[PDB]
Design a protein around this ligand. Structure first.
Ligand code: IV1
Lengths: 10, 239
């Protein structure tokens, strides 16, 4: 989905 | 009048967040794809992608932002990242050079490129005017940081759901900014009004860049020079 954004937000 | 402990503690964590997420040495720029003088797009895309990670790092340390739903955090970051990047770039903008100067002479971005980065003067001309007006405001470190946090916690952005909760956070930050200027800024009688007008300028700059970014991402020969994070944040995908 928002793969990198979810990861970057822990 | 006098600031309270809750308002000064919001300032403390906000100034701390900016110091963690902004490197005045600009030493990480050596790891980007070098600039070529759309030859500047590879370096420009790496520069923006790097800054987006800083904005996400700065956002996660704003009080209350972390407690929002992940959807609200995405919607806020997707629509405000470009404006917060423009806001934070004022720290490298020089009125003497009329350009962004980051440490070395190879990381000095100055106007004539512009067409080598994939953008037109319909964005650069208002942006440079925005950057010089913000530079003339001589914002304190506390004021520059509050403006970034107020800009991020804008409820009137496409995508946010819990509008009431985000608005309450933003108003608390606005009262801090109003109380800080009155008590701590000499001659700040009308600064809060000029700072809020900068937010209105950002929405106009946001709209113009997004129009020009669409032309880049619609040509695969150019969008392949972008980064996955840029394509994710500046994209149109909806949560
Ligand atoms: C991003 C930052 C810095 C400078 C900002 C300059 C900056 C400059 C611009 C102006 C237009 C592009 C550069 C033209 C040129 C420099 C050759 O005259 C626009 C923007 C907004 C983002 C542009 C997105 C480009 C894509 C994705 C291709 O859409 C930032 C350095 C430092 O201050 C840290 C800060 O975090």
């Amino acid at each position: 989905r928002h793969k990198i954004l979810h990861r970057l937000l822990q | 009048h006098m600031l309270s402990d809750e308002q000064m503690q919001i300032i403390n964590s906000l100034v701390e967040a900016h110091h963690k997420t902004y490197d005045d040495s600009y030493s990480d720029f050596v790891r980007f794809r070098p600039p070529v003088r759309l030859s500047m797009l590879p370096h420009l895309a790496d520069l923006v992608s790097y800054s987006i990670q800083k904005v996400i790092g700065f956002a996660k340390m704003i009080p209350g932002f972390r407690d929002l739903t992940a959807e609200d955090q995405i919607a806020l970051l997707k629509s405000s990242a470009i404006e917060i990047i423009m806001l934070r770039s004022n720290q490298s903008f020089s009125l003497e050079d009329m350009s962004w100067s980051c440490g070395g002479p190879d990381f000095k971005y100055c106007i004539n490129d512009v067409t080598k980065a994939g953008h037109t003067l319909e964005l650069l001309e208002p942006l440079v005017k925005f950057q010089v007006g913000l530079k003339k405001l001589k914002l304190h470190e506390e004021e520059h940081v509050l403006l970034m946090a107020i800009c991020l916690l804008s409820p009137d952005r496409p995508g946010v759901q819990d509008h009431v909760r985000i608005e309450a956070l933003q108003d608390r930050l606005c009262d801090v900014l109003q109380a800080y200027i009155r008590i701590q800024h000499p001659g700040g009688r009308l600064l809060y009004a000029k700072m809020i007008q900068k937010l209105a300028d950002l929405r106009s700059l946001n709209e113009e860049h997004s129009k020009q970014y669409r032309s880049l991402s619609f040509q695969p020969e150019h969008s392949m020079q972008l980064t996955p994070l840029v394509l994710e944040v500046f994209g149109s995908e909806v949560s």
